[PDB]
Write a protein that binds this ligand. Structure first.
Ligand code: EQU
Ligand code: EQU
Lengths: 123, 123
């Protein structure tokens, strides 16, 4: 059913772990089949598991970690701060992001909005 | 005009400083006259400076501090992680929150959503 605040904290924490290890198939399965992703917030959203999978395969030697607790509400939504470290054309980079997610009645990610821009990038 | 990503970072950081010192009038002036506030996200929103001022006067010996960088987008929005420490009936408490704000063309807060619940409270 619609995840409780405690369940949202668990789901979002699991999401980061999956991103960290890079299990693309497991990441995609956490999304609803018709989920929408806005990354970064402000740019046109991608829709559906096919587009989401393509996005992650292209994006993910990457490391991800929570940098603070998951903030969860009682209506199936949560927000979390985390950092992503990768390599861009050789040089190591870090990106600080905040994701806001809305889950559906099946415990799957319905909508995801990623807040970040160049000001949160470090090379 | 619509604040740039760098400007959003500055405005949101200033907001926390105002909350920390507790300057109610200065806090209210950062909001648009008809701004809406959802605190915590999930509960009915309050509307207008009068209601917002009443909310802050009731809410603010409180300390507030950013616990990570402000994540800003290019369309006048930002998200930030912070902690609020206060006293509840004698016992000291801490609350971890994430605010998402949308600014208008005048650089004022149009909409604010605060993500938190009992799971983010520490007594
Ligand atoms: C999509 C994402 C936010 C942005 C992002 C991720 C991973 C690799 C990236 C590589 C980039 O060059 C730019 C942005 C990202 C995260 C994976 C989990 C998440 O929330
Ligand atoms: C409104 C707020 C989030 C919640 C909150 C604040 C201040 C005092 C509080 C006292 C409470 O007993 C419960 C919640 C708050 C913050 C002031 C700045 C902000 O974003």
């Amino acid at each position: 059913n619609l995840p409780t605040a405690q369940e949202v904290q668990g789901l979002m924490a699991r999401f980061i772990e999956l991103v960290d290890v890079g299990d693309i198939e497991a990441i995609v399965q956490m999304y609803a089949d018709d989920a929408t992703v806005e990354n970064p917030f402000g740019q046109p959203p991608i829709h559906g598991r096919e587009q989401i999978a393509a996005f992650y395969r292209q994006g993910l030697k990457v490391r991800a970690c929570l940098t603070g607790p998951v903030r969860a509400s009682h209506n199936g939504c949560g927000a979390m701060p985390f950092r992503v470290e990768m390599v861009w054309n050789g040089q190591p980079c870090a990106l600080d992001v905040i994701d806001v997610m809305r889950f559906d009645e099946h415990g799957r990610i319905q909508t995801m909005q990623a807040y970040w821009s160049e000001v949160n990038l470090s090379v």
